Swiss-Prot record, chains A, B:
<dbReference type="InterPro" id="IPR003010">
    <property type="entry name" value="C-N_Hydrolase"/>
</dbReference>
<comment type="function">
    <text>Nitrilase that hydrolyzes preferentially aliphatic nitriles like malononitrile and fumaronitrile in vitro. These dinitriles are converted to the corresponding monoacid mononitriles, showing the enzyme is regioselective. Cannot hydrolyze compounds with a nitrile group bound to an aromatic ring or amino acid. Its biological role is unknown.</text>
</comment>
<dbReference type="InterPro" id="IPR050345">
    <property type="entry name" value="Aliph_Amidase/BUP"/>
</dbReference>
<feature type="active site" description="Nucleophile">
    <location>
        <position position="145"/>
    </location>
</feature>
<protein>
    <recommendedName>
        <fullName>Nitrilase</fullName>
        <ecNumber>3.5.5.1</ecNumber>
    </recommendedName>
</protein>
<dbReference type="GO" id="GO:0000257">
    <property type="term" value="F:nitrilase activity"/>
</dbReference>
<dbReference type="GO" id="GO:0016811">
    <property type="term" value="F:hydrolase activity, acting on carbon-nitrogen (but not peptide) bonds, in linear amides"/>
</dbReference>
<feature type="binding site">
    <location>
        <begin position="172"/>
        <end position="173"/>
    </location>
    <ligand>
        <name>substrate</name>
    </ligand>
</feature>
<dbReference type="Pfam" id="PF00795">
    <property type="entry name" value="CN_hydrolase"/>
</dbReference>
<keyword id="KW-0378">Hydrolase</keyword>
<comment type="similarity">
    <text>Belongs to the carbon-nitrogen hydrolase superfamily.</text>
</comment>
<feature type="active site" description="Proton acceptor">
    <location>
        <position position="41"/>
    </location>
</feature>
<comment type="subunit">
    <text>Homodimer.</text>
</comment>
<dbReference type="InterPro" id="IPR036526">
    <property type="entry name" value="C-N_Hydrolase_sf"/>
</dbReference>
<dbReference type="InterPro" id="IPR053613">
    <property type="entry name" value="Aliphatic_Nitrilase"/>
</dbReference>
<feature type="active site" description="Proton donor">
    <location>
        <position position="112"/>
    </location>
</feature>
<feature type="domain" description="CN hydrolase">
    <location>
        <begin position="1"/>
        <end position="236"/>
    </location>
</feature>
Length: 261, 261
């Protein structure tokens, strides 16, 4: 299996422009043999809003709306599964979500559980929990951006059977790229952090999209500033066997009775 | 406030020799200003036992045994607090323990919750939970070796108000030195990993003792091979206030409803 990130530079409040850029890059990930392609957080809308009104205006329902139906169309055409960050309109409320689509259609969604900084003024805290989606050939867990900061995000997805954690991000702190391989190691999963690049109303994002292995190896890493795709080969038996030596299994050894109490 | 690790090379089954080495190094640390000094896991007995009988023969009681007695004397005489790893005899049972001793005497013990590899043939799994010890001027959490691998260990300690996690270790894998700064960051806590060095019945330990900070900065780090002390100044404001920005407080932001389920 090959997995891929798409590191792009979303244009704030311009979904058509972002649909165009994303298709172009998903097509190149597909040309490169990717079977699963991960896009950044909020790829359709951009990130740095001044008011909720400008995002609410453009934000789409899932699965009914344009971004899901767009991504279905690209999945169908390219034969890839896609995890993508999107602003989700749900009645009068907005979430910071990721959609999972396949060539056969919509698979499901995740709503960001740990909101970061000014996201608290715009978005409602995610309310679907940490979900894992079975694509047949692999189980894919989804978390978004600041979810990386809490070890419980990746751990919950790993317990739930994720082979790979798809991680749409709009990273601003320098830490996540160094921390991601530790997340991968401690759960014995692959992690695919699709970061954005660019500068948006004074806010500069760090890029450095990366794929990490269960041995904390960095299989692919992106620049700080360029749009690009990164594809890495993954070993599905290297993750599904939680043995770390012949006497320890990382899930058998956890002792939940002593945690957080 | 200054904290330290003592990185040393325990001689297997030679507690006299190890007490003597510990005393020289604790005093080097005490001279350099350290108020808290952390020693390696099983510093008195050594690690690489072939039979339970050989460690049972020499393993000491806590607090009345020779190791705790030794440590109380050193701490009475240096004015320091000491966290040290020690094989604990408790009746007819053995624990892989850490003791905390101050100038007053014995403050308390921690029993290693996550046993590693062959340890399960000698020791019982720890049964006192993850404990935080109030020294007045600081709260010290304690975990041992492989406890690092489970994010839940440091997280339990940090939630219980630990300002610093004292971490006696005998590392053989290379990952802990790379992970500890992420444990420090994700909990906004200081961590003190006191590793051993040496080769013990052919098993090589990796040294690389380190002190990490709440910003993922490594403040002090030791060699692969040499016996040494490392001392660093810690800022308690930087741990106690869990705010990473005006809108995010890492403990208020945890959403336990979605963790591990
Ligand atoms: Mg050094």
């Amino acid at each position: 299996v090959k997995v891929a990130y798409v590191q792009m530079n979303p244009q704030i409040l311009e979904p058509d422009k972002n649909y165009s850029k994303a298709e172009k890059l998903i097509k190149e990930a597909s040309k490169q043999g990717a079977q699963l392609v991960v896009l950044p957080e909020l790829f359709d809308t951009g990130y740095n809003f001044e008011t909720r009104e400008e995002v609410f205006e453009i934000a789409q329902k899932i699965p009914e709306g344009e971004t899901t139906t767009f991504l279905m169309d690209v999945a169908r055409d390219t034969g890839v599964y896609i995890v993508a960050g999107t602003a989700e309109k749900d009645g009068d409320v907005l979430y910071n979500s990721a959609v999972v689509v396949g060539p056969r259609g919509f698979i499901g969604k995740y709503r960001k559980i740990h909101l970061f900084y000014r996201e608290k003024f715009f978005f409602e805290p995610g309310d679907l929990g940490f979900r894992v989606f079975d694509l047949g050939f692999m189980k894919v867990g989804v978390m978004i951006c600041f979810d990386w900061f809490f070890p419980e995000s990746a751990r919950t997805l790993a317990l739930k059977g994720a082979d790979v954690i798809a991680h749409p991000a709009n990273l601003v702190m320098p830490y996540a790229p160094r921390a991601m391989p530790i997340r991968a190691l401690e759960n014995k999963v692959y992690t695919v952090t699709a970061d954005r690049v660019g500068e948006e109303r004074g806010l500069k994002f760090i890029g450095k999209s990366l794929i990490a292995s269960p041995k904390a190896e960095v299989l692919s890493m992106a620049s700080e500033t360029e749009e690009e795709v990164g594809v890495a080969e993954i070993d599905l038996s290297l993750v599904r066997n939680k043995r770390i030596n012949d006497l320890n299994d990382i899930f058998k050894d956890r002792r939940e009775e002593y945690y957080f109490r």
